[PDB]
Symmetry: none
Subunit: 103 residues, 2 copies
């Protein structure tokens, strides 16, 4: 019961999803203590941003459970609300191969 990026626009609520992590923004420590991280991830179907409480790094492949979407006005964003549960299921990275130098 998964879904895709550009399909989803503000509203929309319950949403399970796998994706890769492109970029990661700038921290804000709410005075009450929590890590609210906003971040840049997507599937191949375009792009989107997300907000995280007290946890990810680019290059990661994330499974999202029971997350939901609505907009912080600058384009809709994704939450982890009902309980929410983001899991990592694999990696991805850029790789460079060359023949050693000789002799």
């Amino acid at each position: 019961t998964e879904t895709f990026v550009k399909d989803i626009k503000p509203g929309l609520k319950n949403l399970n999803l796998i994706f890769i992590v492109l970029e990661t923004g700038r921290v804000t420590k709410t005075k009450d203590g929590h890590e609210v991280r906003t971040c840049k991830v997507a599937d191949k179907t375009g792009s989107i941003n997300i907000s995280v409480w007290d946890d990810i790094q680019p290059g990661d492949i994330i499974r999202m459970t029971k997350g939901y979407a609505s907009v912080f006005k600058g384009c809709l964003t994704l939450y982890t609300g009902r309980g929410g549960d983001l899991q990592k299921i694999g990696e991805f990275c850029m790789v460079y191969s060359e023949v050693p130098n000789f002799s």
Copy 2:
């Protein structure tokens, strides 16, 4: 019965050795549809060219390690290019790579 890149003479036969792909370049194509790949290979005794048959481009890589058997030589366009014999072969038997992983930025 093996011989080094260094101890190689044009007009030689029974060519059984092992070497590694240094660079691939010079793609030239027949109108059978096939293509012949000019590669630079070597051993610890020196470097040398080769003209290879393979209709698929991107699969012959720097790092590849191949076992030449009963192949042969003749100069081509002034440069010495190596060929396989009509009863020997070429097997890829391993690899050797400067590998390097990361995640980019945007």
